[PDB]
Design an enzyme around this catalytic site. Structure first.
Site, PDB file in Angstrom:
ATOM      1  N   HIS A  44       3.895  -0.362   2.137  1.00 22.22           N
ATOM      2  CA  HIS A  44       2.560   0.102   2.548  1.00 22.22           C
ATOM      3  C   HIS A  44       1.954  -0.774   3.643  1.00 22.22           C
ATOM      4  CE1 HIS A  44       0.577  -2.350  -0.844  1.00 22.22           C
ATOM      5  NE2 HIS A  44      -0.072  -2.737   0.240  1.00 22.22           N
ATOM      6  N   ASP A  84       7.341   1.613  -3.278  1.00 22.36           N
ATOM      7  CA  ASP A  84       6.502   0.799  -2.390  1.00 22.36           C
ATOM      8  C   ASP A  84       7.204  -0.456  -1.880  1.00 22.36           C
ATOM      9  OD1 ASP A  84       4.502  -0.589  -0.937  1.00 22.36           O
ATOM     10  OD2 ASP A  84       2.900   0.058  -2.282  1.00 22.36           O
ATOM     11  N   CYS A 172      -1.353  -9.150  -1.617  1.00 19.62           N
ATOM     12  CA  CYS A 172      -0.163  -8.332  -1.799  1.00 19.62           C
ATOM     13  C   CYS A 172       1.061  -9.069  -1.292  1.00 19.62           C
ATOM     14  CB  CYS A 172      -0.307  -6.997  -1.054  1.00 19.62           C
ATOM     15  SG  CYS A 172      -1.506  -5.885  -1.771  1.00 19.62           S
TER      16      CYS A 172
END
Ligand SMILES: *C[C@H](NC(=O)OCc1ccccc1)C(=O)O
Lengths: 212, 4
Positions: A44, A84, A172
């Site tokens: 992402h 992802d 992240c």
């Protein structure tokens, strides 16, 4: 211990940035080297912006920068379908210490449930340890990704850890580490989302590295 | 939940 696993994660964490050729670098999140020239990184970070393969990818390892055309990294899925987090081979990165044996085995997943964990991550390279409440496993987790234009898309993966905790943008790509010493404080997966005092990490198992 |  958690802290010693955290140190091994910390040494393998790089900052991941994206930019146009001849353009400014946008530093987005963390990537985690796992072995040789392979890293784990949430896709992402790049896959939802226009013409990604014509962009330059940037990797900041303690203030030494490595860059490569997006078309020259080899991206490999962790499992069937969208998960992802991907494996990414970056030929120009210095070899990483192999930490794959510190990831949880699929069969040991039940041993991390209902126990505390620590998110070992950074915000643009500043290392942070974030406490996560007793873990649950969601067979399917959904979260909202805000693109560069400001618009948002909804994303869904198989097998995500959910724990109570406070995250920040840029975290992240960091690694979730179990507090369970009896499974050697295994790395459980990779942080992908946060909000409403909840933290979500994709499960990454040792077996997933068999996909190179 | 948001991408972070
Ligand atoms: C953190 C790494 N650990 C590792 O690969 O250990 C594998 C092992 C250790 C003890 C007995 C059997 C297997 C490392 O850097 O070594």
């Amino acid at each position: 211990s958690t802290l010693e696993i955290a140190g091994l994660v910390r040494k393998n964490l790089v900052q991941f940035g994206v930019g146009e050729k001849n353009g400014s670098v946008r530093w987005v999140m963390n990537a985690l080297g796992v072995k040789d020239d392979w890293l784990l990184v949430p896709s992402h970070a790049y896959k939802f912006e226009k013409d990604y393969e014509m962009m330059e990818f940037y990797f900041n390892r303690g203030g030494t920068y490595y860059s490569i055309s997006a078309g020259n990294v080899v991206i490999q899925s962790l499992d069937v379908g969208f998960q992802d987090v991907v494996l990414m081979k970056v030929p120009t990165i210095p070899k990483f210490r192999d930490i794959t044996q510190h990831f949880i085995k699929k069969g040991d997943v039940p041993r991390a449930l209902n126990r505390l964990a620590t998110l070992v991550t950074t915000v643009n390279g500043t290392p942070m340890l974030i406490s996560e409440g007793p873990l649950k496993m969601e067979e399917k987790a959904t979260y909202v990704h805000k693109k560069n234009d400001g618009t948002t898309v909804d994303l869904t993966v198989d097998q995500a850890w959910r724990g109570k905790g406070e995250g920040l943008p840029g975290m992240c790509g960091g690694a979730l580490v179990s507090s369970n010493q009896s499974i050697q404080n295994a790395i459980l997966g990779i942080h992908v989302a946060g909000g409403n005092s909840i933290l979500v990490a994709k499960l990454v198992t040792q077996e997933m590295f068999q996909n190179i | 939940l948001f991408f972070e």
